Structure formats: structure tokens, C-alpha cells
Amino acid sequence: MGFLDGKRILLTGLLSNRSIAYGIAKACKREGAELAFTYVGDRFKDRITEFAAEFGSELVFPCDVADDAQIDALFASLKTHWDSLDGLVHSIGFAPREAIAGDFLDGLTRENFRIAHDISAYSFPALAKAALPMLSDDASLLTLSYLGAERAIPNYNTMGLAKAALEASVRYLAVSLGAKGVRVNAISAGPIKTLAASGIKSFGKILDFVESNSPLKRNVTIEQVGNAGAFLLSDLASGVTAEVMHVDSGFNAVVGGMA
Amino acid sequence: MGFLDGKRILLTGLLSNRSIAYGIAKACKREGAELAFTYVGDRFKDRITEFAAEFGSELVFPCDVADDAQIDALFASLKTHWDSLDGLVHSIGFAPREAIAGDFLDGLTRENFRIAHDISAYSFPALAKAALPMLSDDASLLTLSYLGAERAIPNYNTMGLAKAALEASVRYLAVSLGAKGVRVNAISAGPIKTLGIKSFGKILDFVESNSPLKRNVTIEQVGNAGAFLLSDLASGVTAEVMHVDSGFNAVVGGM
Amino acid sequence: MGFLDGKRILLTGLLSNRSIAYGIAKACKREGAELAFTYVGDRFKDRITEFAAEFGSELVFPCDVADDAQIDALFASLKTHWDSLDGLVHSIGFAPREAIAGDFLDGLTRENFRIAHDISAYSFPALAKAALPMLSDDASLLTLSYLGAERAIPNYNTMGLAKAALEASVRYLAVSLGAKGVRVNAISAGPIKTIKSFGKILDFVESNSPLKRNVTIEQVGNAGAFLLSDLASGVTAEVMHVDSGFNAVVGGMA
Amino acid sequence: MGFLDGKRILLTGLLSNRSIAYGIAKACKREGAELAFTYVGDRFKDRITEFAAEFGSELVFPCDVADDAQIDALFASLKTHWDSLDGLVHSIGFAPREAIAGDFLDGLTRENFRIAHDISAYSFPALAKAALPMLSDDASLLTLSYLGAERAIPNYNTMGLAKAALEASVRYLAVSLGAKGVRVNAISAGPIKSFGKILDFVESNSPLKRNVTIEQVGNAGAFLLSDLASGVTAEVMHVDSGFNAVVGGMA
Ligand SMILES: NC(=O)c1ccc[n+]([C@@H]2O[C@H](COP(=O)([O-])OP(=O)(O)OC[C@H]3O[C@@H](n4cnc5c(N)ncnc54)[C@H](O)[C@@H]3O)[C@@H](O)[C@H]2O)c1
Ligand SMILES: NC(=O)c1ccc[n+]([C@@H]2O[C@H](COP(=O)([O-])OP(=O)(O)OC[C@H]3O[C@@H](n4cnc5c(N)ncnc54)[C@H](O)[C@@H]3O)[C@@H](O)[C@H]2O)c1
Ligand SMILES: NC(=O)c1ccc[n+]([C@@H]2O[C@H](COP(=O)([O-])OP(=O)(O)OC[C@H]3O[C@@H](n4cnc5c(N)ncnc54)[C@H](O)[C@@H]3O)[C@@H](O)[C@H]2O)c1
Ligand SMILES: NC(=O)c1ccc[n+]([C@@H]2O[C@H](COP(=O)([O-])OP(=O)(O)OC[C@H]3O[C@@H](n4cnc5c(N)ncnc54)[C@H](O)[C@@H]3O)[C@@H](O)[C@H]2O)c1
């Protein structure tokens, strides 16, 4: 009797029990959804299979979003298991290391730009288009963004451009798919404290700053992002589309650091 | 177990079973919350008592937000029933008719401006301030706004100004109350179709034709989003103005 | 010659040679405009008359925007000298001190809220309405706002609400007056170096803005002159940031 | 003297007397600037040379921004005439036609997406980076965007994504170049078949009840390129008769 009972949801981007996708998966499973997962490379098949089993699922599929052949095969494969798809979680992003460090121009190249936008922005509407023939009429598609799309954040650089494109794709997708009934939204998530992420020194300084300056004086967790994601994927949110919802302890709404 | 199980929530602005506050009330009660209600004027005591009964509550209190004493007396009274308050729904707005019809300047007077901002904007942080001594550390405060705060919409006029101030108060309230743990948000709702004004019918038709989902929102949809924001499911969400409007805010419609 | 040649512009809010209105007045005069000024209260009549003379003007008028009668009498008096008005600069703002210091709720009262919104927001469309019978078809109306309307800034508090209402009034005014041809805009100015908390903000902006410097009244003045001029004839309903880019960044996290 | 007197400004995207770049060129020249121009394709060398002479200039350079080598050669060549560059006008945009007509998903392919973002977004910071060694400390860089970056506009489709990335590049460029003193801004211009329907709608529904002209965009651009705008950076300025600020069609 959870608020996602019977909904069939495909999640990308599950790499560990610290992934945002893992938090979303937990909340969706808690609320009654049936889950399926994608992975990148045969070397990760066994590990994603273990995660799927944790969520009562045997449905895992390769999908390197850099490759048309894998996008164009993903939903043909899923269709042999599920007549229709109710939810899609796009939790994927990448840019070369030099493009998200230091000076924006020093780290700028055409290939760095191309890759960042290809993986981090194009892949969301690309997956939506490949899924369309088996989407339920009231399906819900969800992607993940970050405040660096809206305002300049140190080091975020080329990923900020790609996330702005991603957030625009939410709006154009919502129009394209909305007459059928499909909703499309993003969560603009705050930084997440994990063991490895805190080791990244510049990222830890952001965490500390958000902790000191966000309205709630605390960083968000994957359970809080996961719950917001489960809401947007559900019929509870049937009035909500083309929205970029901040789940960031309110950080986006202030000018911090001046008190 | 509903996702508001045990939460004690005060709702203002419940006038009819087509109110947005009605949809929010229904969704909160569905998810296990205990409700209390305000009303304006002794003549409406019976009607609000009936509504509270529908939601299993006997807690109704007068509160004209134009009156400082009634705002203070509201929470003094509620405190004898509830040790702490977990939610507040602000569904209150008003401007004199001429200030929300026709040309913006034609309906502009100092008193029309004053009333619209007093009732529709000041009352939200005023209620929050009076409630603060009994708010739980996890409390959630919710108000209702409209796209006319962000862009100029025909006839909305002076209410567009007041709603912009209201949405700003959401951000300043979130800062003032957030260290304690209290969250503050607004829902920017689309128009709600009931049994009217030729100008309002034109807006409803236009939203149905031009919104991404090609349909107007219902009080059930706004209510479910409200229940979410009032709940621990939304513990990461504060200072947010969430559009519940079939996506209408995100397009340039009509072309 | 200058790009405001022959334009007749009324400026409010000139209190000193540090005022934003003084910087706007200097830029407008530099570009050929004819200027007139308002003042608040009989005690300031001599001081505004001295400032007006610096700009080659003898046109000064009382206008306490709290008073309906002074707003109405202002444009009757101005019409005696000027058949039409080409520009209006609204540089007026006030909130009781407690409402713009400390905690937002600590300083919140109904009367503090009322005054802040009456003086800082209502007065702009009020002046526009009273000016309309004599506005030229290509007049330009300009007000001043601040980033605290858009995001929560420490201590700005009730003024943030009033400036949000003001920026909304820019849009509704633009629609009301636009068919005639009148344009309506705001400048969201950065803080002007001229309080311990205010110094903290100035330091933060200088350290974290893209241009690594606070703005001057000269820079706000030139942007204002631009918006008041035919160079900006395609621009209305705009809130233009003149703030060294500060609004566009998340500072302090290095 | 004009408010751009002596400023040396390079303009891209001048294809005809209807180009936004032509309106900016005319205003900049009126205000005393010295101009240089780029062009694409040897077949257009004559046409751009005529435009340069109209504005009292002999300085024209080939630059297809799809090609790293042409971007690098552009500023190497320009440096043999100008020791420093005071202004740059990026007025370049392209997507394959099917990506900006009809339904958003019908025109969406990896290669259409790549081209639209390559030409319409990457090229602005690419040019900025190649120009940097010769940019004056107080130089001003200007790009052109459109409301489709902010809200979904019919048919604009993949170009809406690319313009959103472009407007973000304005903000990251302003941070990167700002300590030096360089300013970076965009003008979100109103529109200048399904396109004529949009012009009618904007004329009927914008606050000023009229479409913008390249003269109005050009004067706003000259302002942003000048020291009058020395307090302004990282800004996207709407020059669109107020259209961005309303919900039209409902009256
Ligand atoms: N981690 C945060 O603090 C944070 C904050 C805000 C937003 N986000 C966004 O949330 C999403 C998930 O991020 P995260 O927190 O899990 O960490 P992350 O950004 O390190 O994860 C990126 C994910 O993309 C996947 N990916 C990369 N290249 C791929 C390809 N070619 N094909 C398919 N998948 C590919 C990876 O497997 C990984 O799971 C991302 O879009 C990220 O930008 C993250
Ligand atoms: N109805 C819509 O289409 C719509 C759309 C977007 C936002 N909203 C907002 O949602 C809220 C509720 O809207 P609604 O649909 O229930 O109808 P509504 O617009 O009639 O709500 C106004 C409410 O304010 C209350 N109120 C008025 N003056 C009061 C006073 N002095 N003291 C106390 N309460 C007072 C009334 O009792 C009423 O319940 C309002 O804030 C409204 O602006 C409504
Ligand atoms: N000074 C800054 O750093 C800064 C930054 C951004 C925006 N702004 C805004 O720019 C405008 C000018 O501010 P400022 O920097 O010159 O200083 P200021 O904000 O202290 O000046 C306020 C002005 O309003 C006038 N005023 C106050 N009450 C009035 C009344 N009842 N009737 C008529 N006029 C009245 C005063 O005479 C004064 O000229 C204000 O709107 C202010 O909020 C200022
Ligand atoms: N035309 C409008 O209504 C409008 C409205 C808002 C914004 N804009 C933007 O303003 C700019 C100029 O638009 P416009 O009205 O002059 O027409 P336009 O959009 O047709 O011009 C695009 C320009 O890009 C140039 N270009 C294309 N590919 C190129 C390449 N590989 N290398 C170099 N240059 C290349 C073309 O020569 C052309 O001048 C564009 O960025 C456009 O998106 C236009």
C-alpha cells in the first residue's frame, strides 16, 4: 500500500550504496515499486546484479549512454520483461577531470565540452526518446542536477554548462511528452557527504560551507533526495512537471558567507 | 502507516470543499495527521466545525489575521490542546475587487495596496512568529502563491505584488527558522476550475490548451504536493517555491 | 550631442553627493538632460535647491510619498514648467531600523511591514499613476532594487519583501504603460561603499564578485542614464544587475 | 566623442543588413569604435569586405568556429593589425534544421545535439580563450541568446538547450576573466511560417506591443561593450520589448 505500489521503474547510475540512485532505489522499493537497473561495462554486471537482488530484482541491462547501440537496445530488451515502463531515473554525469577543476578557460577544450554535454545532458532526452514506445501514459521521468547550472560555483566549470542544458531539456521534454500524460522533472540536489567525497578537499569545503550557511544548517542525505525522487516519480506528484526541485537544505535561496 | 502519521497540523483558509485547503486537509488526514482549523467571524463557526468533524477534529479557533490579538490568542488557545505544532498551512489571501481586475493602475490605491499586502503577505510570517514558541524542531510551514508573482498576468495586478513579497517571506522565514530545523515553503498552484468570471474562464481554457500536461490541476494534486512538503519525506526541502501547475510556468504558451 | 539630449527627467531621493540619485543625475546631465528634483520636508528645501543649482536646475518640489496630497500636487506643479515628462527616477526606500537588522522575525511587526512596503514599493507605481497624464509617449521610469529581493541576505529582512514587491510592480507597470510606449525598469545595484555588518558585506562582495570590486554610483549612474534613454528603447520590465556580477556567483566556498 | 571612441571591436555573424551583428556594428561605429569582422567560406569574402568598407574597415578574417585551427589563426592574424582587442561580439548560432522544427524528440540525435552545442555554445568561450592573450584588461565580450533558454518555446527545441549552456558560459566566463578586468554579458534578444506566428504573438502580447529591431539590440550591445557598462558583468539582458516578463495570450 506504498505510494508507488506496482510502479515499474528503471534506475541508471547505481554504482554503490552511496550513489544518489541507491537512495532513490531504497525509497521507491519501500513504497512498493518494482525495480530494474542499468550498468556500464560487463565488468560491473556481477556487482549491479548483487544490488538488484538487494531490491528483489533480477532485471539488469547494459547502457553506456555514449553508445547509440546500447541506448537503442535497452528498451527493446526491457520490453521482453515489462509491457510498459512507469518511471525512469537518470542519475548520470561525467566531465574530464581538468574541465571541473581550477580555471574555467584553462580546462576548456572542444572535446572536454563535447564529452560533458554528451554524457551529462544529451543522454537524458536520448533515453526518453528510446523509451517512449513503451512508456505508460502516466509515466514519470526524473533527472538530477546541481546549483552550478544556475550560478557560477568554484571548480564546477564545464559541468555547469552541461547541467544548464540538462535543466532546459527537462522543459522541452515535458512539452514533447506531456500531451500523452508523461511528466518530466529534475531534482537540483545539494552536495552529499560520503567517505570518498569528503576526502576530496575542495568538495569538503563546499560541504562545510553549506552546513554553515544553508537555512537548515545541514547537508542533505541520499535518503532525503531519495524521498523527494520517489515523490516526483509517484502519482502524488501528478500535478508537477517541467520542475527543477531543489533538495539542498535551502542553500540555493540564500547569499551565504557574509554574516 | 501514512507518511504524516502523528503529525499535528493547523490549517487556515478552509472555506469550502473546493478550497485548496480542503484538498490539503483531505490528503493530510489520509496520511494520518491530526488537524486543527481556523475561521474568520462567529458566523462561520458552525461551517468550520462541520469541516473539522469531517476530518475527525474538534479543534477550531477564530483568527482574523487583520488583528494582532487574534493571532496571539490563536496559539495561546491551541497550546492548551497540543504541546507542539508540526505543521501550518497558510491559505489566506485578499485584495479589494478593483485591485485584481482591469488595468493595474486603475485599481491601484494606497489602501488597496495596504490591505492586499497586510492580508496576503504579512499574515504568513506573522502567524509563523506567533507559532514559534510551540513549533516542533521538525515543523513545516506551507503557504500558497501564484505565477503572477513571477511574471505579469492579466488582472492579477496588485495581488502579483503581494505574492512576490509572500514568496520573499518564504526565504527569509526559512533562514530565521531553519537553524531550529523548521522548514518553510510555498506551492505556486495553477488555477482551479470551479463553477465564473469570463476572464478566469479564459485563463482556465488557456492553461488547458498550453500547459505541458494539457490539463488544469486539481485540489487533489495540490493537496498531495502540500502533504508531501508538510511531511518528513520533504526534510531536505526548504525555502522552495514548488510549482504545481501542470508545467504551465515553464513554457511560453499561445504561439 | 549626449544621448539624453533634451530629455526632461525628475529624480527623487537625492540626499547627498553619495546618493545613487546623485550619480544618476550627474550621468543624465552629462548626456544633455534637463533635471528636476523632489525633497522630503521643508527642512531639506534649501539643501535640495543647492544640489539642483549644481545641475543647472531651479526645479525643486516637495514630495513625501507617504502623503497622497503631495504626490498629486507634485505633478500639477511640474506641469507648470514642463508640458511633458520624459523620465522618472525612483530612488526611495525606508524601513524602521529594527526591521532591517538582526533576525527577520525579531524585527517583524505589522506597522514595520506596512511602512516598509508603503514607502519602498507602493510609492513607485503611485508616482507613475500620478505622472501618467503628462508622461511623454516614450517616457522611461526607473527604480532601484537590491539582490535581497531575489535571495535571502543577512539583515535585509523586511526590506527584502518590499523589494520583491517593487520588482513585481516593475512588470505590472510595464504592461500597464507599455501600449502608450512608456518603459519601466529597475536597477538591482550592489552595495555602495559610503555599520559592521555592512562592511562585512562590502568586503565579501569585493572578494567574491567576478570583477573583484564594489560598484560606484558612477557605474550605477551610467546604467541608469542608459535605461532612461532611447538607447534602451527595446528594454522594459527588466531588472538589470549593476553589481560587478555578484548576483551570478556562489561566493565564499574557496 | 562617442562612448566607444577608439575601442577596437571584432564582430562575428554579420551575414547581411538584417543580421543582429549589423545593428551592433552600426551602433558601435556611430559611437567611435574601430571594427573588424569574421566570415565563413571563401565565397563570402567579397560580401563581408563590402560591409567592412561601409564601416570604414579593411579588416576581415575567415573563421568557421567548428575548426580549432581557424579560431587560432583568427587571433594570430588579428594580432598583426591590433596589439590588443577591446571588444568581441559573438553572434553565431546553428543547429540542423530538423532539430529546430517540429517536435523536440523527432529532431533529437546525438550528432544534431553535438553540432548545436558545438557551434552555438562552445564557440563563445572557445573564442574568449583564444583571444585572451591579446584582450585589453578592460575588454568586454558579448553574446546573443534567446528566451527559449529559460522557458520552452515551440520549435526552438535543441537550440533551447544550447542557449541555456551559452548563458551558463557567460557566468563562468565572467568569473574566469573578471579578476583581469574583462566583462562578459549576453543580450537575450526578441525575435527579429511558424516564425511569423511568433512575431505576431510578440507584437500583440509584449508590454510595448511591438517587436524589437536590430537597431535596438545594437544600441544595447554598444552599451554593454562600453565603459558605461563597467559595473555590469555575468548579466543576461533582455532586449525584447518586455516579452520575457509576461504571460501573454490570456487577455
Ligand atoms: N553527488 C552529489 O553530491 C550531487 C549533487 C547534485 C547533483 N548530483 C547529480 O546526481 C547524479 C548522480 O551523482 P552521484 O551523486 O551518484 O555521483 P556521480 O556524479 O559521481 O555519479 C555519476 C554517475 O554517472 C554514471 N555514468 C558515467 N558515465 C556514464 C556512461 N557513459 N553511461 C552511463 N552512466 C554513466 C556513473 O556510473 C555514475 O553512477 C549526477 O547526475 C550528478 O551530477 C550529484
Ligand atoms: N484558487 C486558485 O486558483 C489559486 C491558485 C494559486 C494560488 N492560490 C492561493 O491559494 C490560497 C487559497 O486559495 P483558494 O483556492 O482556497 O481560494 P481563495 O483565493 O478564495 O482563498 C482566500 C482565503 O483567505 C481567507 N481569508 C481572507 N481574508 C482573511 C482574513 N482577514 N483573515 C483570515 N483569513 C482570511 C479566506 O477565508 C479564504 O479561505 C490563497 O492564498 C490563494 O491566493 C489559489
Ligand atoms: N545604497 C546602496 O548600497 C543600495 C544598493 C542597492 C539598492 N539601493 C536602493 O537604491 C535607492 C537609493 O538608495 P541610496 O543608496 O541612495 O540610499 P538610501 O537607501 O538610504 O536612500 C533612501 C532614499 O529614500 C528617500 N525617502 C525615504 N523616505 C521617504 C519618504 N517618506 N518620501 C520620499 N522619499 C523618501 C530618502 O530621502 C533617500 O533619498 C533605494 O531604493 C535603495 O534601497 C541602494
Ligand atoms: N534572429 C532572431 O530572431 C534572434 C533572436 C534572439 C537571439 N538570436 C541570436 O542572435 C545571433 C544572431 O542571429 P541573427 O538574427 O543574426 O540570425 P541567425 O540566427 O540566423 O545567425 C546565426 C549566425 O551564425 C553564423 N554561423 C553559423 N555557423 C557558423 C560557423 N560554423 N562559424 C561561424 N559563424 C557561424 C552565421 O553566419 C550567422 O550569421 C544568434 O546567436 C541567434 O541565435 C537571434
Residue D144 sits in a domain whose CATH number is 3.40.50.720
Integer angstrom CA distances of residue D220 from C177, D28, D136, D198, D217:
21, 10, 21, 22, 5
Q: Whose CA is nearest to atom 39 of ligand 1?
A: A13
Question: What's the number of domains chain D is made of?
Answer: 1
- CA atoms within 13 A of residue B213's CA, in its CB half-sphere: 28
Least Cα distance to D2 among D222, D244, D233 occurs for D222
Q: Report whether D98 contacts D129 (CB < 8 A).
A: no
Q: DSSP label at B213?
A: T
D251 contact B CB<8A: yes
- Answer yes or no: is the C-beta of B144 below 6 A from any ligand 2 atom: yes
Q: Compute, in angstroms, the gap from residue B15 CA to the centroid of ligand 2.
A: 9
- Chain D, residues 123-152, CB within 8 A of chain A, namely 125-126, 128-129, 132, 149, 151-152
Determine the residue of chain C that is closest to D208 in CA distance.
C178
**CA gap D103, A198 in Å, rounded:** 43
Asked whether the beta carbons of residue A104 and residue D125 sit closer than 8 angstroms, the reply is yes
Elucidated via: X-ray
Q: How far is the C-alpha of A22 from the C-alpha of B12, rounded, in Å?
A: 38
Q: Chains that contact D by 3+ CB pairs under 8 Å? A: A, B, C
| Window 169-228 of A, Cβ < 8 Å to C | 205-206, 209, 213, 215
| C168, closest residue in chain B (CA to CA) | B161
- The Cα of D116 is separated from the nearest Cα of chain A by a number of Å equal to 11
Residue C240 to residues A193, B206, C224: CA-CA distances in angstroms?
37, 31, 10
Q: How many CB atoms lie within 10 A of CB A197?
A: 14
Residue B56: CB atoms within 10 A of its CB come to: 9
Give residue D204's region: left, alpha or beta (phi > 0; psi -120 to 50): alpha
Distance CA B217, CA B192 (A): 6
State how far residue A206 is from chain D, nearest Cα, in angstroms.
18
Given a contact as 3+ CB pairs under 8 Å, which chains touch C? A, B, D
What residues does C89 pair with on adjacent strands? C11, C142
Distance CA D104, CA A129 (A): 10
Q: Find which of A147, A169, A177 to mutate to test the D interface (most D CBs within 10 Å of its CB).
A: A169
- Is D146 known to be catalytic? yes
Q: Are residues C237 and B125, on separate chains, in Cβ contact within 8 Å?
A: no
Residues whose beta carbon lies within 6 Å of some atom of ligand 3: C 13, 15, 19-21, 40, 64-66, 91-94, 119, 144, 146, 189, 191-192
CA–CA separation, C123 and C213 (whole Å): 32
Return the ligand number nearest the Cα of A65. 1
Instruction: Compute the distance between CA of residue C112 and CA of residue C108 in angstroms, rounded to an integer.
Output: 6
Q: Are A190 and A210 in contact (CB under 8 A)?
A: yes
Which ranges in B38-122 belong to alpha helices (H)? 45-54, 68-79, 110-117
Domain that holds residue A57: 1-259
Q: Which residues of A are part of the catalytic machinery?
A: 146, 156
The answer to whether the beta carbons of residues D107 and D158 sit under 8 Å apart is: yes
Burial class (CB in 10 A: 0-12, 13-18, 19+), C44: middle
Q: Which residues contact B238 (CB under 8 A, 6 or more apart)?
A: A215, A216, A249, A250, A253, B174, B178, B183, B184, B185
Answer yes or no: is the C-beta of D91 below 6 A from any ligand 4 atom. yes
In ligand 2, the atom with minimum distance to the C-alpha of B143 is: 41
- Write out the H or E segment, with its range, that includes residue B135: strand B135-145
Deposited resolution, Å: 1.9
How far does residue D11's CA lie from ligand 4's centre (Å)? 12
Three-state secondary-structure class, residue A176: helix
d(CA B35, CA B87): 9
Counted across chains A and B, CB pairs separated by less than 8 A come out at: 126
Q: Is the dihedral of CA B144, B148, B154, B159 positive or negative?
A: positive
CB D122, CB A110: distance < 8 Å: yes
Q: What is the DSSP letter of A216?
A: T
Residue in B with minimal Cα distance to C129 = B105
Location of C-alpha cell 504573438 = D201
Q: Which amino acid is at A48?
A: I
Nearest CB to C151: which of A153, A209, A255? A255
Q: What are phi and psi of B240, to 5 degrees?
A: -100, 140
Cβ pair B239, B39 in contact under 8 A? no
